[PDB]
Design a protein around this ligand. Structure first.
Ligand SMILES: Nc1ncnc2c1ncn2[C@@H]1O[C@H](COP(=O)(O)OP(=O)(O)O)[C@@H](O)[C@H]1O
Length: 680
């Protein structure tokens, strides 16, 4: 279909044409003629290579221009909201304001009312719905990207919940990978179903087994080693993406490949890569990343800060970095190699889900540069036919509502009571009746039981109250916990230990307490280091708020408190990565969450009259945020600074914002500006 053949405002067609887009893919055409332009809901299951977002953008912009109102675009992760935020920019060229909201849970962000397209994660949007933001009533369409993740245990319940509140109140468009139960999901959504595997660039999938690649079509090709697939890609002027199941694994493989890929690079490429590696922030994890980039290959996993991941992401696009070895969580190229089909799980090593293996292979074949994309699954100790039959011809897993997730369900039952007006068991059960859990007609009895037991726990801890008529009402602790977005249990742990906190409020005691609640995943420790951890604990137990571990979460929480303490004590990131065996990306993630939990602890204190420690906690909140000593807090409002600069400034001079408001710029570059002078 032709962009002009579409029945939508010229302002959409203009934007498209400017994007290079002149014609719609067959799948896109089907979706655009299904009824979405006329407000109907839809579930779009087609290859990512086939422009799923584009269809959502067109449906969103058409909804807005033709009838006003707002459009919500739910993204799976914070970082994916920034990618969607950029590609949505050119919509401001026709007057549409685009906002990005992904955190700061305890606010209603009424300031979002002046926007047309709001990008958010499901949790952020779930919290906004709890605060009752006035503009929410203006959302006429909501797009759920990666809607299949609704079947993911971790956070699939949150996505299901917002989709349950919004259904029948707004147009809903879901974007998902191929799944086992398309019709089921579509029906629950009362949506038009668009299922297709049409792609712009032919994809050939195979299995590499002992020197040979066997393609689904039947042919067999010789390759001395799987890594040869990479070197072959590179010699034909293309690139490769390699997937492994463990960080250190990605790091090892990346370096190994770079050892042979380097000899495959032109002189210019070598320079850029070298300039690229020299331009990386010092620390152990970047050291490795540097060494392999100089060789033309890169690794990528959550262990790297977001800054480094982006650097890899773009330079791979720019064709400078020839290959990228990446782990699944937070990851187009001629060849996509899936090096591992087995992954270490909390359930014990298991095979990567079919659904995920298809998404990985789907990234093979850049629409312009290639006449075909190749997806290769490497089996080391696995029957080649079984791998082929399971991953290339096996129906993808069907999605299962992950609503029963006890942590999400206790936080959600409370949200209904304290922020949505549910005052009866039967009312709560009515909300559940509208979820995908209910539509799948899954375990009904066991869910009720889990809900009554939850109500009890909530009743026993004073978040809510119940009467002899069985009427439920929220108490301040209830309401306050629901608006802070914390797990009722972390509020319960905050409430139980509050007396201990006020008796002796200290970083170690605090950092350890929050690192032990359900809203934070504590750093891991090895058999080796559990040595010191043991001694230090018994050495500091006085400052903690707990009697005696006797247990694994405990010391993981304690290890985390030591990292956090080093963080606020301005210890070099490098020194922390070393002296604690932790990678930068984990530090930030943990710092980010810590700031949020210390804030929530302060707020809970406010609700329990414990106001004397509120200042202390507020102070600690900022220190955790920027990882800085108390006397560096004023200087943090500046454009940029971070613990590094801020310290250099305070010591080598300045201490206030007025102090920088009157320093010879000559005296700043003398150690540290453009942004700063720009800020003033
Ligand atoms: N009809 C089309 N014509 C040309 N390129 C397209 C078309 N649809 C998608 N694309 C390409 O696919 C890229 C992928 O993003 P997008 O289209 O939003 O799909 P997805 O949500 O699967 O990433 C776009 O930036 C563009 O390069």
């Amino acid at each position: 279909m032709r962009v002009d053949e579409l029945r939508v405002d010229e302002r959409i067609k203009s934007t498209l044409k400017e994007r290079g887009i002149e014609s719609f893919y067959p799948p896109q055409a089907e979706a655009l003629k299904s009824g979405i332009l006329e407000g109907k809901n839809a579930l779009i299951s087609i290859p990512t290579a086939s422009g799923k977002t584009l269809i959502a953008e067109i449906a969103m912009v058409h909804r807005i221009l033709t009838q006003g109102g707002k459009a919500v675009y739910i993204v799976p992760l914070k970082a994916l909201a920034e990618e969607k935020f950029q590609e949505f920019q050119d919509w401001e060229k026709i007057g549409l304001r685009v906002a990005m909201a992904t955190g700061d849970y305890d606010s209603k962000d009424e300031w979002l009312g002046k926007y047309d397209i709001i990008i958010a994660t499901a949790e952020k949007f779930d919290s906004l719905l709890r605060h009752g933001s006035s503009w929410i009533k203006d959302v006429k369409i909501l797009v759920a990207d990666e809607i299949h993740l609704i079947g993911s245990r971790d956070r699939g319940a949150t996505l299901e919940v917002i989709l349950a509140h919004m259904l029948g109140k707004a147009q809903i468009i879901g974007l998902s990978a191929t799944i086992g139960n398309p019709e089921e999901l579509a029906e629950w959504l009362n949506a038009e179903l668009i299922v297709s595997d049409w792609r712009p660039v032919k994809l050939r999938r195979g299995v590499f087994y002992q020197g040979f690649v066997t393609w689904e079509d039947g042919s067999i090709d010789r390759f001395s080693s799987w890594e040869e697939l990479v070197y072959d890609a590179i010699r034909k002027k293309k690139g490769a993406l390699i997937f492994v199941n463990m960080r250190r694994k990605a790091e090892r493989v990346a370096l190994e490949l770079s050892k042979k890929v380097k000899s495959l690079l032109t002189k210019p490429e070598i320079r850029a890569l070298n300039e690229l590696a020299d331009s990386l922030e010092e620390n152990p994890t970047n050291e490795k990343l540097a060494k392999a980039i100089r060789g033309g290959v890169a690794f990528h996993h959550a262990g790297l800060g977001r800054d480094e991941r982006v650097l890899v992401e773009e330079n791979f696009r720019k064709g400078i970095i020839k290959a990228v070895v990446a782990t699944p969580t937070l990851s187009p190229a001629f060849r996509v190699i899936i090096r591992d089909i087995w992954r270490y799980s909390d359930f014990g090593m298991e095979r990567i889900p079919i659904i995920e293996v298809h998404q990985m292979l789907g990234r093979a074949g850049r629409p312009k540069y290639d006449e075909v994309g190749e997806g290769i699954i490497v089996s080391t100790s696995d029957d080649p036919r079984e791998v082929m039959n399971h991953y290339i011809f096996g129906k993808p897993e069907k999605l299962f509502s992950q609503l029963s997730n006890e942590s999400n369900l206790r936080s959600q039952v409370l949200a209904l009571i304290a922020t949505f007006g549910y005052s009866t068991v039967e009312e709560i059960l009515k909300f559940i009746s509208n979820t995908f859990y209910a539509y799948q007609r899954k375990d009904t009895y066991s869910l009720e039981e889990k809900i009554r037991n939850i109500l009890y726990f909530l009743l026993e801890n004073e978040f809510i109250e119940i009467s002899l008529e069985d009427k439920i009402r929220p108490l301040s602790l209830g309401i306050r916990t629901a608006k802070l977005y914390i797990d009722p249990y972390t509020a319960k742990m905050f409430k139980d230990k509050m007396e201990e906190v006020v008796k002796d409020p200290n970083p170690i005691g605090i950092f350890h307490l929050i690192s032990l609640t359900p809203d934070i995943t504590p750093f891991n420790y090895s058999k080796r280091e559990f040595e010191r951890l043991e001694e230090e604990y018994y050495e500091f137990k006085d400052r903690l708020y707990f009697d005696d571990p006797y247990e694994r979460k405990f010391f993981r929480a304690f290890k985390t408190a030591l990292v956090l303490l080093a963080w606020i004590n301005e210890v070099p990131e490098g020194e922390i990565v070393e002296k604690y065996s932790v990678e930068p990306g984990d530090i930030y993630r943990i710092v980010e969450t810590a700031e949020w939990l210390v804030y929530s602890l302060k707020e809970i204190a406010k609700v329990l009259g414990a106001y004397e420690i509120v200042d202390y906690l507020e102070t600690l909140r900022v220190r955790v945020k920027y990882g800085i000593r108390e006397e560096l807090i004023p200087l943090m409002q500046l454009p940029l600074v971070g613990r590094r600069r801020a310290r250099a400034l305070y010591n080598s001079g300045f201490r206030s914002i007025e102090d920088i408001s009157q320093a010879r710029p000559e005296e700043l570059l003398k150690i540290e500006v453009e942004a700063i002078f720009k800020f003033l």
